[PDB]
Prior knowledge:
This is part of a larger assembly, with 9 protein chains of 8 kinds.
Chain A (H helix, E strand, L loop, with lengths): L48 H19 L35 H10 L2
Chain B lengths: L6 H12 L4 H14 L4 H13 L3 H13 L4 H14 L2 H14 L3 H13 L3 H18 L7 H13 L3 H13 L7 H11 L2
Chain G lengths: L2 H9 L31
PDB class: splicing/rna
Keywords: Spilceosome, DHX15, gpatch1, splicing/RNA, SPLICING-RNA complex
Entry title: Cryo-EM structure of the thermophile spliceosome (state B*Q2)
Amino acid sequence: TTAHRPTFDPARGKEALRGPAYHQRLLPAYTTLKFRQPGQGGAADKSTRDLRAELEAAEAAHYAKLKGAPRRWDEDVVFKNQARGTEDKGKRKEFVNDLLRSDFHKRFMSKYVR
Amino acid sequence: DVHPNNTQLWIRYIEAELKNRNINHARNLLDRAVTRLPRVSKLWYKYVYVMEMLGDIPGTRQVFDRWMKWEPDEDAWNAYIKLEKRYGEYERARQIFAAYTQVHPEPRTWLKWAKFEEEFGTADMVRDVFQSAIQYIAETLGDDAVDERLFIAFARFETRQKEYERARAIYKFGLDNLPRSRSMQLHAQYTTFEKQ
Amino acid sequence: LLERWLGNLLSRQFEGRHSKGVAKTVTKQRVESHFDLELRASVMADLMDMMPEGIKQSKVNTVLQHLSEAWRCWKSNIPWKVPGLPAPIENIILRYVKAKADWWISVAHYNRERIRRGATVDKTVAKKNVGRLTRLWLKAEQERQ
Amino acid sequence: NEWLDPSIKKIEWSREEDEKLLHLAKLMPTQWRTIAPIVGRTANQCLE
Amino acid sequence: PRPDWHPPWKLMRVISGHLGWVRALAVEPNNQWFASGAGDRTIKIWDLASGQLRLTLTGHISTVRGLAVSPRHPYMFSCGEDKMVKCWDLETNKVIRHYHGHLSGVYTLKLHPTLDVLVTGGRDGVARVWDMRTRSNVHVLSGHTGTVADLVCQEADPQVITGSLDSTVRMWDLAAGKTMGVLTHHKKGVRALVTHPTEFTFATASTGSIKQWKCPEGAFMQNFEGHNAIINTLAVNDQNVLFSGGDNGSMSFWDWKSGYRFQSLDTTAQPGSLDAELGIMSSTFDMSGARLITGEADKTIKIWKEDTTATPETHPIEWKPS
Amino acid sequence: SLKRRREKLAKSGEEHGDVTYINEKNKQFNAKLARFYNKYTAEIRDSFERGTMV
Amino acid sequence: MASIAAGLAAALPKPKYSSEHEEPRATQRGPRIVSADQIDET
Amino acid sequence: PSKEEVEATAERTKNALAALVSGALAAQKPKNVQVNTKREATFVKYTPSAQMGNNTKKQERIIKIVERQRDPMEPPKFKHKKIPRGPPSPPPPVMHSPPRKLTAEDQEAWRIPPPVSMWKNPKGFTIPLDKRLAADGRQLQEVQ
Amino acid sequence: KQYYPTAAQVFGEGVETLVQEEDAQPLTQPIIAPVEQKKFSIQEADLP
């Protein structure tokens, strides 16, 4: 059947109706605009090269901060030392762009599907 | 209104008003169509064909003049020239080649002008056309950037006029001031001419 | 409140109902249908912008049917490779199937947390969520085999 | 899945498929649904 | 025109952290932090120097397709595919206003530079002009026959220029809410617009063609040519740098005056991304212009910096006049 | 054009080979499928025509 | 700057078949209409 | 534009948009009574042109226009109507660069296969089993 | 098992790859901090 259909021509916006007002639609709320006070920044433009210098100084400061520069009881046991290198996970937390193979999905699906 | 730039709808409405002999209506439609869609070759072709089938050769010429104002592709200039060659105003077709080589300065248009002047004009006109082609193409694109086919057609034309030494001069000049990677066809035609 | 309500009641009575004036919000019963509306619009815009000029664009909803089948093949872990489908169209389809899949998996994670906590009581949410995690487990187990 | 699938080979076996079948049946004992995709037939065909 | 020498741009920092494509990007006037809205329905506030995640805000139920931090007010505006345009009070980190009325998903959002007006563009094919204070839709700029994919506000006529996916670009007189011109030069959907900050010119980008125009005449000034991809974005510096980012992942840095493409790149996708997932979805220079923040379909914010090592001689202008 | 339409209708009205459709739209779709996909599914085609391996 | 065209035009010897008396190879059927440019050339 | 003319544009646009803001604020929440009892007259100097016949006594007219005292309790007078959207303003010419020279290789390079679903069939079609099993990559997968 | 390369193998060596999956701020802490008054004694604004 073709009762159930896609959209190939989505609905188009209309201008407002130029009619007499009787209907109530939007109750007033937050009718006062806040402005950036002195100290809240924004209302001060200095130049371009000063901004570039400040940006590069902040980047150099962050890189400086990151760098830091100013009978034995276990002898009949069949297998010994099976857990070397297992605790070494956590060298650097790494992002994989696959939500089916990310570590979050594996943790989630091992927690829940028991 | 719903589909303004649809060529099929435009042609359907024009033909629907042409089948009922509403010629003035359909000419208004064709002006509106080629105003709305100036770079659609089918609408321009339909307007020039309708004007030629109605007998108005000056109307066909004015429609072609507006189209050539719009700087169309090669086939439109070719169609205009074939019109004027059909009706015999060869000087008008010569003017159209002047503007056509202005708009499309590729060697194909120069060769087409040379062939046209060979068949419908004096040999001095062909020599002037070929010299203008070599001069313009080596001036704009660079002296080493001139096409070998220009020298081929010029030398074969001077061969056809039996000015044999002049053809040897064209061939030798082409083999001198061209790279070796772009004169192999010129070299082969030179060998054919020399042992011919 | 009541004078507002009676004024709107009398507005419907005396100047009529404006049946589709203002856009309805995307409430929870319209989330997946709205995601589908937006997804189909986005895929269609990419095809209408990446096709060359002059190509006969008569059959382009066919790409949207390909996107639907590609999504179904993603859910059922069946490899999707249409013979003769061009690389540009295939790239668009694979890109948006990845995007839809990520939205699906995130919604599954969120509802599973809410089902664990008891924050929801609707049966449909639980049924949908068990279906999603059954598919996810079987995808992981096919990968394991 | 076992009979009407057009990827099912109903011809008599080759010697190469016999060598592969016996080799794999020695590799994976009584794991016939594993052997069947590798050999190239169904599981009941390889078993019989 | 002889082009100027511009240093080439290289990848500085890669910031993972969204779970959907980064479609929006907006820098504070004070250049301290920037705002990435993404397909994981969220707006993240990141510090610009360190790159660290400061905050995550969730108010949208669909992908965040637009952001703006107001230079006069302590507000941040957003729009999304969920038909919603919201005003966030950054003194509380909470949504305080709604701007309702778009019939379907909203693709772009800009603020008028001088006066307190918000213009948004949407898949209902229309650009709605809103008042910030009263949330009232003062104008419904209509006339496009397709999705309004990008939009710029300007301090003088034409005040609103909208580019749509039906390939036209309309310039709108804001006082009357009616168009003063249509530019039909583009063959396919005009996804990007940008305005030069010091010259009274602008640029529109469709697939393959980036055309540069003059205000208010809409006069065709020049044509950036060579980027044969679907152009999603456009970013001009103060030092005449046009950035064409392209949905296949292709990056082109042009000089604004001449049109010379002084750099061409392909961006790189994260570990795990498909080759289909290579593509630039958003881009903006910061307020200084020293950095270019791009957001890509591998769910990644990338920062691009100028190479200080390169000289005008190490990368000479290979520009051939004709 | 009307003669071309009638000739196309008469040519497609003639059947040749097996019937794999149930109405005329299905027949047109199946012929379009053949025109596009015969160059990829020859082996499966002969698998049906043979009763055995691809 | 047309040194190559000048070198060509110097390289060709004079054609030995005269064409200054030669008519155009297609006879224009009359009448002949000119523009304002050809008023003083006749 | 210079600061003076930018500011002039700002004042004009702000005036127009403030008028539309005020009208919209009256739309979204009207005052409970729509009575404006501070009715001031409006005097109009009316100099007529020629008309249906001739002129009789006096031409120039002084007109006093006042708003009518409407009942505060009256609802809207007239039902609103659903009218289709009007035609657009006339489209401009399509100012395209000359069309791309395609080849038959390109037309073949942009052919979209007819889609045969493994799940859906909204027209109840009978598809050949060759074409149904055409996009199933599972049989053509590798095993090793 | 690791199906993909690492970020350093993909992006380069002079490129800093950040992975941020937690906020630095709590949501209660505002981005543009509002200016405080913080009056602690009833003091006259001028001389009575």
